[PDB]
Swiss-Prot record, chain B:
UV-B specific signaling component that acts as a UV-B photoreceptor and plays a key role in establishing UV-protective responses in plants. Upon UV-B irradiation, UVR8 undergoes an immediate switch from homodimer to monomer, accumulates in the nucleus, interacts with the photomorphogenic repressor COP1 and regulates the expression of the transcription factor HY5 by associating with chromatin (through histone H2B binding) in the HY5 promoter region. One of its GO terms (molecular function) is photoreceptor activity. This is Ultraviolet-B receptor UVR8. Disruption phenotype: Hypersensitivity to ultraviolet-B (UV-B) illumination. Abrogated induction of DHU1 in response to UV-B. Disruption in a plant lacking DHU1 alleviates its hypersensitivity to UV-B. The chain holds residues 13 to 381 of 440 of the full protein. It is found in: Nucleus; Cytoplasm, Cytosol. It comes from Arabidopsis thaliana. Changing G190R: In uvr8-9; loss of function and interaction with COP1. Changing W340F: No effect on the interaction with COP1. Keywords: Acetylation, Chromophore, Cytoplasm, Nucleus, Photoreceptor protein, Receptor, Repeat, Sensory transduction. RCC1 repeats lie at residues 1-19, 20-72, 74-125, 127-177, 178-229, 231-281, 282-333, 335-369.
Length: 374, 369
């Protein structure tokens, strides 16, 4: 028998969401805040179909810490659900949602990408404009003030600049332009904006330290940031209390700092977790580093890693997708297998009742293969 | 003989009690170390916190995802749990899975400790106040917005003896020995009581108190509760879930007397995430606000915008109450300890259990079955 293709995986703080072929969205892990979208508030230790979105032709899903977002191109609709405080759902109120509701303000808009932080969200349009909503106490919305926004608003600072992709951490935000410029704004106290100081910004400010390179992508962890250049070089900045910047030490960096141990690899995907980091090379090799108390790094132990270590998979099958949560990691491989590792107490690994795992464990429910090495 | 429960405190998803015989017990969510047992696992039943055996603890106080306790004889304050923004006070941001002394407070005579989400405060016997932790909205009251990893004195209170303090998500309140009421920190929902929605970086005196002196204050997540010298209860700040208890859902920017309780004398108050509890001088406990998980304890799952009495078997008098984010704890005159509301992290302490919408006895700590 054949499973559905996993088109997209996204990890939240304690939950996990996936879009499968056949217009099917499934969610598992912590459900207490309505982030799973199954109507109730219970955790689900196994991938569970999100009926509410059946036949809504969803094209992508993105998790925030304790909420989830999804959008449909054909429907021209963005849906949101979960913890609602500070307007992170963008419905013009602070109500939690335990089932998906469309973001009226985004109806009819052509969405290119969506990013979710802890308490704020951003959407990039096909034209390259950006709209943001949610908590704004430190300027993370990039609107020039510090007032929360319960509805999406355009970032006027970016007019005339085509944005390629955006990313969001706990309370900071980053972006890269089509022509390769890197921006940061929001809470900046650990150097995570990349601007060379520890001060907040209320509008996007361009990062002028990029190793002389244009930047193709950016990702945010909780209080650290990661970017990849046009040459596939990897840069990290912000907090490194747990070694999550990956430079072989525990020092913060206030400007982008090239990760020299990966200088001979081309990075194709990046993801930032609460206190850990993942980077995926063009040859499908996954590297992880940072906090590993619960084994979220995936290297077979529970010791923190301040330098990149290759995460190994059965038969060295290549990885094609990776997403970091707060205490867990998810990955999709070339064989249409899904793996999870790290903390399992909210069911976020999706493998039925389970202890925590410190190396990749297959999610049989979503995978072609069965358990290996048995 | 069941040890008497002396003090109960509820965190966001955890529960902590001080028992006679100098032992601390903790249960509920354990993932951030807030239980203090060294591991990171939830405990469905009250579990003795061995590291504090024989430390002569006199009080415990829960923040959202951390816990504080102090000893008079040892002149020591301890903290453990989620460490971010310096909420534990040890000069760093490290989580702690077992209690450690807050060195900065070593030898200080402690009158009271309050814990919010990400910041804490200690009042000294002399009425001075020290604060530490997150400060992005001025909640430490130090006149800036820089987080502090160690306790710092609130100089704004020099010459003003503080009686008691309280801490919400990112706001703080206090009452003075003379009965003046103060507010500071994040103020966006009117929860400072100052008549507006602006933050304050230093304490500001509440000037509209119905011409009354205040003896107590407590903070919920984004609301604030105070009690006057005449036992009158006032609430202010957020009432989206009816947590202010006035019968409507409008926010109040200044303290507002809860008229339904005007004939009662309130002896104890507690603010939860989105609900509230008030205990009368004659042992009647009233709850109100958000009730999705049954945390109001009225035997149902509907929100309650006016105070409703929490019923116990035979109307046995309640002597103590403490609100969590989705649960509530109480102790009664019969030395029973009840818990209700959300149970998924084990916070009710009744062993593996679903949620409860009316008080359930904690057999491990209680006389009655």
């Amino acid at each position: 028998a054949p499973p559905r293709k996993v088109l997209i995986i996204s990890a939240g703080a304690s939950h996990s969401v996936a879009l499968l072929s056949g217009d099917i969205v499934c969610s598992w892990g912590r459900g207490e805040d309505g982030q799973l979208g199954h109507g109730d508030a219970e955790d689900r230790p196994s991938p569970t179909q999100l009926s509410a979105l059946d036949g809504h032709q969803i094209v992508s899903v993105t998790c925030g810490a304790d909420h989830t977002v999804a959008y449909s191109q054909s429907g021209m609709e963005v849906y949101s659900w979960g913890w609602g405080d500070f307007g992170r759902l963008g419905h013009g109120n602070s109500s939690d949602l335990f089932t998906p509701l469309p973001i009226k303000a985004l109806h009819g808009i052509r969405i290119k990408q969506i990013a979710c932080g802890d308490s704020h969200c951003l959407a990039v349009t096909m034209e390259g404009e950006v709209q943001s909503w949610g908590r704004n106490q430190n300027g993370q919305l990039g609107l020039g003030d510090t007032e929360d926004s319960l509805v999406p608003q355009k970032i006027q600072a970016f007019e005339g600049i085509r944005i390629k992709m955006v990313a969001a951490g706990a309370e900071h935000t980053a972006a890269v332009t089509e022509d390769g410029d890197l921006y940061g704004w929001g809470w900046g106290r650990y150097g995570n904006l990349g601007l060379g100081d520890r001060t907040d910004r209320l509008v996007p400010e361009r990062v002028t330290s990029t190793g002389g390179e244009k930047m193709s992508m950016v990702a945010c962890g909780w209080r650290h940031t990661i970017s990849v250049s046009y040459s596939g070089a990897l840069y990290t900045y912000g907090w490194s209390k747990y070694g999550q910047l990956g430079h072989g030490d525990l020092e913060d960096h206030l400007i982008p700092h090239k990760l020299e141990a990966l200088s001979n690899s081309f990075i194709s995907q990046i993801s930032g977790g609460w206190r850990h980091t993942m980077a995926l090379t063009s040859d499908g090799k996954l590297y992880g580093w940072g906090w590993n108390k619960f084994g979220q790094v995936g290297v077979g132990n529970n010791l923190d890693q301040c330098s990149p270590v290759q995460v190994r998979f059965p038969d060295d099958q290549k990885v094609v997708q990776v997403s970091c949560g707060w205490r867990h990691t998810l990955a999709v491989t070339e064989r249409n297998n899904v793996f999870a590792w790290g903390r399992g107490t909210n069911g976020q690994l999706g493998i039925g009742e389970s202890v925590d795992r410190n190396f990749p464990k297959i999610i049989e429910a979503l995978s072609v293969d069965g358990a290996s090495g048995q």
